[PDB]
Amino acid sequence: YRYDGKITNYLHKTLAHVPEIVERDGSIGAWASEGNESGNKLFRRFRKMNARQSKTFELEDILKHHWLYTSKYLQKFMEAHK
Amino acid sequence: AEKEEGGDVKSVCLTLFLLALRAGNEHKQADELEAMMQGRGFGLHPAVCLAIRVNTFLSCSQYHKMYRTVKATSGRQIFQPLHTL
DNA sequence: CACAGTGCTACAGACTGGAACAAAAACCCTGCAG
């Protein structure tokens, strides 16, 4: 009664093309939007804490500081080797 | 210890040592040693630590994170651990 | 089977002491050897 002529995009996508793409990419969910998205949280705080702050320079120093946040070289240090 | 104090462990070692060093002396050490116990910090007094956490807005876990880092690398840890804060 | 945390809790781990054991390090030695 609820699926006669209508199906949500995802229910179809998840019931149809999943085995195929898992066969092809080798895996999925590692490729998820999550690794992006989450980052958005930072973009908010880096727009307050670390912002300049004026419209001109703001994107510049957010972007820079973000890049610095992402780098491995630093995280290596912050592990403190156990 | 029994004849002149009775259980005062700290001082007997302290007074012989500071002064014994400044016997064949370059001074350099006298500053580090005279600061060493009661005044002040050595490392940093826990009140100064507490203030430098609370007032710069460091998350507890964030603070401890830093503490671990500064301790492990070239330490000689400076900051005081959380439970003493 | 998102992931970096979220503080305070829990008590896991880090400590002494003599009493004595053992192993190992690197000397000296004496032993039996050309």
Tally the helices of chain A: what do you get? 6
Instruction: Specify Rg of chain A, calculated over alpha carbons.
Output: 20 Å
Let me know the largest β-sheet of chain A.
none
Order of SSEs of chain A: HHHHHH
Looking at the chains present, what oligomeric state does this protein adopt? part of a larger assembly
Chains forming the largest contact: A-B, 4 and 6 residues
Family (chain A): Belongs to the RAG1 family.
Protein name (chain A): V(D)J recombination-activating protein 1
Organism (chain A): Danio rerio (Zebrafish)
Subunit structure (chain A): Homodimer. Component of the RAG complex composed of core components rag1 and rag2.
Topology readout:
The structure is cut from a larger assembly and holds two copies of chain A.
Chain A lengths: L8 H8 L1 H8 L8 H4 L1 H7 L9 H16 L1 H8 L3
The first copy, chain A, binds one DNA strand of 34 nucleotides through helix 3.
Account of the 3D structure:
The structure is cut from a larger assembly and holds two copies of chain A. The longest helix of chain A has 16 residues, at 55-70. The termini of chain A are far apart. The first copy, chain A, is mostly helical and 82 residues long. In chain A, 62% of the residues lie in helices and 0% in strands. Chain A binds chain B through residues 77-78, 80-81, and chain B through 65, 68-69, 71-73. The first copy, chain A, binds one DNA strand of 34 nucleotides through residues 29, 32, 34-35, 37-38.
Fill in the keyword field for this structure.
part of a larger assembly; 2 chains; 82 residues; mainly alpha; 62% helix; elongated; DNA-binding; recombination/dna
